[PDB]
Amino acid sequence: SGFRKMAFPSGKVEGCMVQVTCGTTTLNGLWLDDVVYCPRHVICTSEDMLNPNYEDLLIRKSNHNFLVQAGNVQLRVIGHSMQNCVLKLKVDTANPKTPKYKFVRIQPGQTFSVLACYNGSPSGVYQCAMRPNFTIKGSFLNGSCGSVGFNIDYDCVSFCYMHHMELPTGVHAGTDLEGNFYGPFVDRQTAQAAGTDTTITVNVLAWLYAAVINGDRWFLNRFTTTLNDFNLVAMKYNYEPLTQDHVDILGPLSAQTGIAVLDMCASLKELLQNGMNGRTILGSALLEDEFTPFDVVRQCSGVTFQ
């Protein structure tokens, strides 16, 4: 028992992390087979990063302008190209540590692990959710650009995120690994801002089921509610609508605890109208929304990865 924000073991990703330097800009790259992936703004200068024409900037570059360090070993760049907002640096050595991998794009509400890196060196690992407004509430300092987010499915790494920039509220924006930004953000210095967020309702319900599995029951009740009536309360509290498919996805957790999904909706209703009255749930005094139903089942059942 117990319930923690759990990341995937990071080893398979650590073996892919490299340092990419262009001019005076150093950031992180992701090295798979014979290609290094990194944010294309590596080729921009201070004044470039205002309003740049990336095609123009790249044609002025040569292979030898890109310095790639795999630990203390230098990788020779033999080709370069742009794909949307990422660069693809062709190197003359395939990474012997390349795991089985995929490039997937995730949905807001889903989670992933982040391996924060600086100068190609892994610093720490933590779990994030893609917010409904397509930002992530990460932990990133200067030089973290190119750090990646990922999930692990048995032995296969699904890369879903590469870090690009911090927004003025301190939240973070990035792309999938085909270089397509999550949300309405661009790799230019504009006045872009996050835009309004909501709470991931299905995840909050999953987390209440984690609590019940772990012995927190004070918020349960005998009342029930309809889906339509619950969603009227969700709207008034900036929670997003609950679908029948969310209800179906919560089926297994429902069946394990014996608490009907709409019953737990009734409990969430009361928590929203009454607050928590000085009590806690799974060591939180807030309703937590960054665990998916998948995350609860994995942790409250115990699936591994090899």
Added chain:
Amino acid sequence: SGFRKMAFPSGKVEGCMVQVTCGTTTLNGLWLDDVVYCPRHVICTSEDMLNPNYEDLLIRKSNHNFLVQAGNVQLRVIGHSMQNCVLKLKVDTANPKTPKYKFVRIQPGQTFSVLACYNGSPSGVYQCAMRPNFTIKGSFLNGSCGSVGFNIDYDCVSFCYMHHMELPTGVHAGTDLEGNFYGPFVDRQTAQAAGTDTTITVNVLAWLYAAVINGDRWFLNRFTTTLNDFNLVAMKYNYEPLTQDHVDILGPLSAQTGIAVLDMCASLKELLQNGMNGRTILGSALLEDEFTPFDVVRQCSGVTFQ
């Protein structure tokens, strides 16, 4: 910016994790050079685990009774011995993935990363603190025994914890890697229980400094307090005393934010007497005590490991 519960990259530990089976008991072992370390209760049966004489149980065992699987490769056991509450299984192959390492024992109030494992396969990584009552609030299911906790210092892994058991409140107890239990717990089935805990005051102050670094300032004030007067409030709220050495350790964070340590104590005082009045700090509605001053400086400055 941003502040997350961050674990160390787990790769160096993942390469050491193995499966140890004795009879019908399977748990995890830690494989370094030619020795596998694991909880000695692996040699106990159901009825053994009531009140066992471990010396008696071990003399009845042979090398071939211990099955060790390093992934899909079987390691031949060539020697076995007890050291306090751990077994040391001598195998005929030195682990080629052995990192530079140390066996350290940590202090309550300090943090470490846990690589939760099942059947020798890494499942997930997360950050824990050693509680003042020598328990950890982990996330562990059946078969996690032998999972380890660790810190990373440049390239050196300091192992500080091996998991043994869950206590009736759902918290967790274990040993250092010389097999000496943290706190007054034994690897027998007794009515042992955690015993009263307190809040790690210096860590809460460190976390308030993380908040100020990250733009949360609503809890600051102009008042100050003396150390003696702060500690009178700490006692009334089950917070442990603050020492001059805690004040000294908070010096750098103080100097970076320009908020005197005793000033921040005054702020913590008010938070304890008034609560948080529907506001949050670093996305928490509770005063958080599982980040050391070291953790805040590492994350709010950006140190890596290689």
